[PDB]
Amino acid sequence: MEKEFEQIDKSGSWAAIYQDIRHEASDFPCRVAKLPKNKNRNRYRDVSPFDHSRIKLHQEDNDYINASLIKMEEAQRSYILTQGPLPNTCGHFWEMVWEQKSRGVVMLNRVMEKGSLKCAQYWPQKEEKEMIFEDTNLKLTLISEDIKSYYTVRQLELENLTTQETREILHFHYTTWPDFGVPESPASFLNFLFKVRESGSASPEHGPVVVHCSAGIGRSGTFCLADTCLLLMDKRKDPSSVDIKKVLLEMRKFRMGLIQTADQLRFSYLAVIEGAKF
Ligand SMILES: [Cl-]
Ligand SMILES: [Cl-]
Ligand SMILES: [Cl-]
Ligand SMILES: [Cl-]
Ligand SMILES: [Cl-]
């Protein structure tokens, strides 16, 4: 696989490989995402979930959230990819986490990047200042946080104020993705991915891990694509038969636009190449 990478670099065809993926990617309707009543539930009018794979909210209200269930059958893992919650969709976001029984939330952006807001402050920064989402009847409390040099893991308690039931949610926040471009090295990103794995958050006993960046297709796509390919390499008899392009096209049946740049495609290959050694 490093041989294919080398040939693509020693030729400069990443732009070519990437545009072919764009051309071959699935197109399915997003009728619900584009309904007028959902205008303010979408961070980017150009990034919408497909109707067939969108996550539906269960409460008696508009069921819409910009989130997609990516179900990877051969790798036997599901992910929920979603946009960075908006100030008016944080309650919906946590309702989704509750209803989908997710145990982990993976965040790949800072709330502020290059001086701009990519995401709402959707979890509490202080133990004593919990967040109440009156619309969806949820309370979210910061229990503790383990701040590391390249990522933070937070223990959150999500309480359904309706049943008084509580659940521990792990919040995995990769905090050092560069402002521009992709990490020169996949080392940190891979260490982060393995930390999420060993937390048990992506275990099949839980709901799908929720993964988001700002639009939920770029860095998020890199995360899911790398994780899925590494799973496929541990399963197949011929690990080098894993075709990253084919995997990405499979994931793009479930959410449009996964991997936003040729650089992100190149980084994904690099992350799988390096992650396979370990
Ligand atoms: Cl909200
Ligand atoms: Cl942040
Ligand atoms: Cl930077
Ligand atoms: Cl494959
Ligand atoms: Cl695209």
Swiss-Prot record:
Tyrosine-protein phosphatase which acts as a regulator of endoplasmic reticulum unfolded protein response. Mediates dephosphorylation of EIF2AK3/PERK; inactivating the protein kinase activity of EIF2AK3/PERK. May play an important role in CKII- and p60c-src-induced signal transduction cascades. May regulate the EFNA5-EPHA3 signaling pathway which modulates cell reorganization and cell-cell repulsion. May also regulate the hepatocyte growth factor receptor signaling pathway through dephosphorylation of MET. Keywords: Acetylation, Endoplasmic reticulum, Hydrolase, Membrane, Oxidation, Phosphoprotein, Protein phosphatase, S-nitrosylation. The modification Phosphoserine is found at residues 48, 240-241. The chain holds residues 3 to 280 of 435 of the full protein. Residues 1-275 form the Tyrosine-protein phosphatase domain. GO terms for biological process: actin cytoskeleton organization; cellular response to angiotensin; cellular response to fibroblast growth factor stimulus; cellular response to hypoxia; cellular response to nerve growth factor stimulus; cellular response to nitric oxide; cellular response to platelet-derived growth factor stimulus; cellular response to unfolded protein. It is an enzyme of class 3 (hydrolase). The modification Cysteine sulfinic acid (-SO2H) is found at residue 213. Oxidized on Cys-213; the Cys-SOH formed in response to redox signaling reacts with the alpha-amido of the following residue to form a sulfenamide cross-link, triggering a conformational change that inhibits substrate binding and activity. The active site can be restored by reduction. It is a peripheral membrane protein. Its EC number is 3.1.3.48. The modification Cysteine sulfenic acid (-SOH) is found at residue 213. The active site is at residue 213. This is Tyrosine-protein phosphatase non-receptor type 1. One of its GO terms (molecular function) is protein phosphatase 2A binding. Its main location: endoplasmic reticulum. Expressed in keratinocytes (at protein level). It catalyses: O-phospho-L-tyrosyl-[protein] + H2O = L-tyrosyl-[protein] + phosphate. The modification S-nitrosocysteine is found at residue 213. Interacts with EPHA3 (phosphorylated); dephosphorylates EPHA3 and may regulate its trafficking and function. Interacts with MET. Interacts with NCK1. There is a cross-link at residues 213-214 (N,N-(cysteine-1,S-diyl)serine (Cys-Ser)).
